[PDB]
C-alpha cells in the first residue's frame, strides 16, 4: 500500500540537451516517475522520467536544464508517479503552477494523494447532464445554455474581454448551495492574475475558490501539470465530497503553446502548425474529465477559455477543442469595436446539451422554438447586410428591410447587457420574443402555428 | 579541473572534451585568442559548445578555459554614458585601447574599467556587526551630477558586516564590504555579476498608477502610458520614430534610460550613436547632456547572432539593476523584429522545429518572459524603496501587415500601442501617431490618479474620441453626396474635428514652444475646445453660418492656443489666459 | 437632349458602381484569402520535408 | 467461439447489393442513396452533426442489428445512446420491443487509451461479421475513423517510422482498405443457405 524502502540517489548523469536529462546505471527505472534534482549550486528542481531504455532514464526537468552539471548534480528517484496532496482545505487558497502555496500559507495536510493523470470514467456509469445552469447572460441563457456537467469553451481572441465575462459567469452561476469554483491560470500576465484575484475577494467568493495561477514568467513545462492539478482537486471535491464544481481553465492557448515546445524538444511527429500528433488525446485527457456519475450527487463543469490566433477558428487550438467539447461560446472582435460588452457572435457558437436542458419542465415551452428563429433571423439579416453593401441601400426587397430592422435591434437589446446585470431565463425569453414581433406571423418558419398562438400575440 | 581541449570544430560548433564539471549554458573561452562560446550539449566528458565569434584557425587541442557562469552582466559604476554590444563589451573602450576600427575577435576587455576611481561613501546606518539581507544599500557612489549610484548587496548572499570601507576613492577591484556567514566569510567589491536570463528578485509587484509624461500632446492625453507599462510602436522607415525615441529621453519623468539597438543596421546605428551624445537635458539648473543618465546597447548585424539575441536581456538587466536602486527606468528596445530574426538563426542552427513562418516554438514564451519583467514594484532591501521599468518595444513587420508571428504576438502582450502611420508623414502631420488604429488599456488604472490631480480630464478626452470616430463615417459621404445634404448638427462636429487635428494633436517638435507641453497646458488646450463643442451643440438646437463668420476671431484664439509657451510663460498665466478664453466663448454665445 | 442623357447616365452608373463593389467585396476578398491559404499550406510542406 | 479480429471471416460467395438502406432522412434516401452491404463516409467539421445522422440511422433504419463503435469520441455521446434507446421501440411482428435489444456498443472514448482505438474498430467489425453469418442485415457505425488514423500516427511516431503526407504512416490507406472491404451483402457459409449483409457508415473528422 505504502512505499517503505529508502530512495536511491544517483550522481550518474551522462547526457543533457534541451530540457532532457539522461541518467545512466539507473536500477529498474519506472515510466512517468518523479525525480528530484539538486543542482551543484544547491537549488532543487523536479523532473519526470519520459522514456526508459535498459538502465537509462530520460528525465525532463520542470524548470529547465540551465546549470545542470554532468558530475556534480545529484538526482533522487522518488519511487512513485506524480501524486498531489489534495484536501478540502484546498478551497480558499491560491497556488502556483507546481504545487506550492503563494498566499504566505502552509502546505496541504493531504486528506489523500491523488494521481494527477487521473483515470477515465466508465461510460456506462456516466449520466447525461440535465440541469441547466442559469448564468445570467442573455447570449448564453437564451441560445447557448450550459448544463450541469457540460464542457463548453469560450472561443476568444487577443484583447477581447474574455477575462471579464469569465468573472461575470462566476458570480451569476446558479440553477434555473454555491459552486465550488476551481480556477487555473496558465501563461497569464500580472494584471490578469490580479484581476481574477481581486474579483474573487470583492464578491466574497474566496471562501470556496481554489486559484491555481501560473504566470507568464513561470516555467513552460509547469504549464502542462497546471490543468492536471486543478482537475485532480476538482475530482476530489465533485466525486468524493459531493460538491458542484465550476472549473475555468483560462488561456488554453497558452497550455498548447507550452505543449508544442516540449514535443519539439523531444522531436515528436508534428501535426498541423507544429503541434504534436497527440494534441487531440492530450487535450481530451483534461476536457473529458467532466460530467457527473450515477453513484454521486456531485458534478464538475469545465469552461476552458482560449484565444484563437488571428481570429481563426481553423487554427489547431480552437479546431481540436470543438471536437472534444460540447459546443462553444464565440466572442467577436467586430462586436467589441461597437462597445457591446458581451461581444458574443452567436452564429459559430453552439451548445450541444441545450436541447435536453430546456423545455416544459426545465424552463418553459417556447424556449426551443424562439432560439431557432432568433438564430435564423440573425443569419438571414447578415446575408442581407452582405448584399446591401454590394447592391445598394435602396435596391432591396421590402421584406429585406425587416432583417436590417432585426439586427440593429438584436445586438444592442438582446446580447448587450452590462457587466453586473443577471437576466433570468424568463427575462430573456420575454426580451427575445419582442424582436420577433417586428416580423409577420408566417415569416417565422421554424416556429409552428401551435406555440405561435400562445406567445406571439402579446 | 579547469581546462578542456577542443577535440573538433565543425563550423560555429565546437565539441570540446575533458570538461566534466561543466554546466549547461555556461560561457567558456575557446582557443588561444579566447573566443567566447556557451555550452549547449553535455555528453559525458565532452561538452558541445557553439562559439559566438568566428571559428577560423582553431586547432584540435587548444585550451577551453572554463569560467563557471552563464551570460551575465557586470553591474557597477562606470555604466552611464557607456556603449556596449549585446554581450557587454565596451565599444567606447575597444576603440580606445586598440586604436583601430575593428573588433579584434579576442577581446575580453572588462565592461567596467578598473582604473577610474569612484568616491565611495557608506550608508551611515551600517556599522561593524550589523545583520544585512540581500538588496540592502550599503553605499552610494556619486557617479555624475544627476545619478547617485547606490551600491547594493547582491540578492544571493547574506551575512554580518565585519569590514566596511572608509569614505574615499576606490577602484572596482578594491574590497569594500566583507560579510561573515555561518561557514566562511565572503568579501566582494562594488561590482556584482548577474545572469541575464534570470529574473531579478523583488519583494512585491505593485499595480501601475502613475503615468509617463512623455511630452507629446496626443500621447499624454488620448493614449496614455504608465511608468511600469509595456508599449509598442511600428518600426517603419520614416513615420515619427526618431522624435518619439528622443522626446522620451529628453522630456520624461524617468530617471535613467536604456536604449537597446538590437541588430539594427550599419548607418542606422551610427546615426543613433552620434545623435544621443549631442542631446541636451534641461534639469532645474543648467543644461546637461543626456548621457549622464543614459546607457546604450548598440548592435549592427555584422556582430554575432548570439550577441544580437541576448541584447534584449542585457538591456533589461541594466534596466532592472537601476530599478532596484529606487529609480524609475524607461527602456526602449529599438527593434524586436530584428531580435526575433536572431532567434530564427539560433534555432535554425540547432535544427529546431519551426513553429510558424520559420520562427521557433518558444517565440511567444520568450517575448512574454521579457515583457513581464516590466512593472512598478516595491524593491528589495530594508531602506524601503520603490522602482519601475517601462518598456517601449518597436516592431517592424514585413510589408506593414499586422499579421505576423512576432507582431500579432506583441499586440497580445503589450497594453499600449502608439500606431505611427506612413500616410500622415506624407501630409506633414507631426507627430504621425494615428488615432483609429491606436489603443491604450491603462485607462482604468489611471482614473484614480486623474481624479486626485486633474479631475476634469477623464470625460474631456472621451468626448474628443467620439468626435474623431464620427469623422471617419462622415468622410465617406462628403465625397458621396457632399456637404449640401450635410446636417446642421453634423457639419459643426466636423469643423471642430479639424480644430482637433490642427491644434491639439499636431505638434511641431522644432518650435521652441511645443517641445515639452506639460499636462497643465494639455488639460487647458482641450477643456477650452470641448467646452466650445457642447455650447455649439445647443446653438444648433435653438444657425451654422453665423457662428463661423462672427466667431472667426474666437476661431483664431483657439487656433493660437498651442502657442502659449510654458517655458517662459508661467503656469498660472497660461491657466489665467485659458480662463479668459473660456469667458469669451460663454459671452459670445 | 439633357433629359434623355441624364436618366441613361445613372442607369449606367448603378451598373458600374455595382461592378466596382462586386470586385472590392466579393472577388478580391476571395483571392486575398485564397493566397493566404497557399502560404499556410506551403509552410506545412516544408516542415514535413 | 473465439475468432481473431484481423482475420476476415470466411464466406461462400459475394453478391451484388440490391436492396437500399433507408436511413429515414429525406436527402439521404432520395438524392444520395446507400444500399445495405455498402460503404459510406460522412466527413464534416465540428458542429455539423456527424453524430445526429449516426443516431438517426441507428434508431430508424431497416437494418436487423446495429453495432455502434465510438472510436475516440465524446463520453457523453456513448452515455446518451444507452439512455434514449431502451425507451424507443420498434414493431416487427405486431409486438413492440426496444431498439437496445438489437444494438451492441463498442465504446472507446478519447479519455481512454490510444492504441485501443484500433482494437475497437476491429472488434466492432468482427461482431458485425458474426451477426452477418446468421442471416441478419448488420449496419456498423464507426463514429470516427479519423481518430483511428491519429492512433496509427502516434504509434508510428514512437517506432520512428518514416511518415507519409501530414505525418500519417505510409500504410494508412491499407488499413482503411482492409476495414471497408469487409462490408458487403454476401451469401453465408453453411447448409441452411442464408444471406447476410454489413453496412459500414464511418464518419471522418477532417
Ligand atoms: N435535426 C436537427 N435539429 C436541430 N438541431 C440539430 C439537428 N441535427 C443536429 N442538430 C444540432 O447539431 C449538433 C451536432 O451534434 P454533434 O453531431 O455531436 O456535433 P459533431 O458533428 O461534432 O459530432 C447537435 O448537438 C444539435 O444541437
Ligand atoms: Mg459527435
From Swiss-Prot, chain A:
Function as written in the Swiss-Prot or TrEMBL entry: Non-catalytic subunit of the V1 complex of vacuolar(H+)-ATPase (V-ATPase), a multisubunit enzyme composed of a peripheral complex (V1) that hydrolyzes ATP and a membrane integral complex (V0) that translocates protons. V-ATPase is responsible for acidifying and maintaining the pH of intracellular compartments and in some cell types, is targeted to the plasma membrane, where it is responsible for acidifying the extracellular environment.
InterPro entries hit by this protein: ATP-synt_VA_C, ATPase_a/bsu_AS, ATPase_F1/V1/A1_a/bsu_N, ATPase_F1/V1/A1_a/bsu_nucl-bd, ATPase_V1-cplx_bsu, P-loop_NTPase, V-ATPase_su_B/beta
Tissue expression from the record: Expressed in brain (at protein level). Expressed in all tissues tested, but highest in brain and in adrenal medulla.
Amino-acid positions noted as binding ATP in the UniProt annotation, renumbered to this chain: 352
PANTHER family to which the protein is assigned, alphabetical: V-TYPE PROTON ATPASE SUBUNIT B, V-TYPE PROTON ATPASE SUBUNIT B, BRAIN ISOFORM
Localization: Apical cell membrane; Melanosome; Cytoplasm; Cytoplasmic vesicle, Clathrin-coated vesicle membrane
Membrane topology reported for the UniProt record: Peripheral membrane protein
Keyword ATP-binding part of the UniProt annotation: yes
Main location: membrane
Gene: ATP6V1B2
Family: Belongs to the ATPase alpha/beta chains family.
HAMAP family: ATP_synth_B_arch (MF_00310)
Phylogenetic classification of the source organism: Eukaryota, Metazoa, Chordata, Craniata, Vertebrata
PROSITE patterns in the record: ATPASE_ALPHA_BETA
Domain of life of the native organism: Eukaryota
Subunit structure: V-ATPase is a heteromultimeric enzyme made up of two complexes: the ATP-hydrolytic V1 complex and the proton translocation V0 complex. The V1 complex consists of three catalytic AB heterodimers that form a heterohexamer, three peripheral stalks each consisting of EG heterodimers, one central rotor including subunits D and F, and the regulatory subunits C and H. The proton translocation complex V0 consists of the proton transport subunit a, a ring of proteolipid subunits c9c'', rotary subunit d, subunits e and f, and the accessory subunits ATP6AP1/Ac45 and ATP6AP2/PRR.
Single GO term (MF): ATP binding
SUPFAM superfamilies: P-loop containing nucleoside triphosphate hydrolases
GO BP annotation list: ATP metabolic process; pH reduction; proton transmembrane transport; vacuolar acidification
Protein name, as recorded: V-type proton ATPase subunit B, brain isoform
From Swiss-Prot, chain D:
UniProt note on tissues of expression: Expressed in brain (at protein level).
Modified residues (Phosphoserine): 178
Residue positions binding ATP: 44-51
PTM statement from Swiss-Prot or TrEMBL: Phosphorylation at Ser-178 by AMPK down-regulates its enzyme activity.
Subcellular location: Cytoplasm; Cytoplasm, Cytosol; Cytoplasmic vesicle, Secretory vesicle; Cytoplasmic vesicle, Clathrin-coated vesicle membrane
Subunit structure and binding partners: V-ATPase is a heteromultimeric enzyme made up of two complexes: the ATP-hydrolytic V1 complex and the proton translocation V0 complex. The V1 complex consists of three catalytic AB heterodimers that form a heterohexamer, three peripheral stalks each consisting of EG heterodimers, one central rotor including subunits D and F, and the regulatory subunits C and H. The proton translocation complex V0 consists of the proton transport subunit a, a ring of proteolipid subunits c9c'', rotary subunit d, subunits e and f, and the accessory subunits ATP6AP1/Ac45 and ATP6AP2/PRR.
Function: Catalytic subunit of the V1 complex of vacuolar(H+)-ATPase (V-ATPase), a multisubunit enzyme composed of a peripheral complex (V1) that hydrolyzes ATP and a membrane integral complex (V0) that translocates protons. V-ATPase is responsible for acidifying and maintaining the pH of intracellular compartments and in some cell types, is targeted to the plasma membrane, where it is responsible for acidifying the extracellular environment.
Similarity remark: Belongs to the ATPase alpha/beta chains family.
Protein name as it appears in the record: V-type proton ATPase catalytic subunit A
Naturally occurring in which organism (per UniProt): Bos taurus
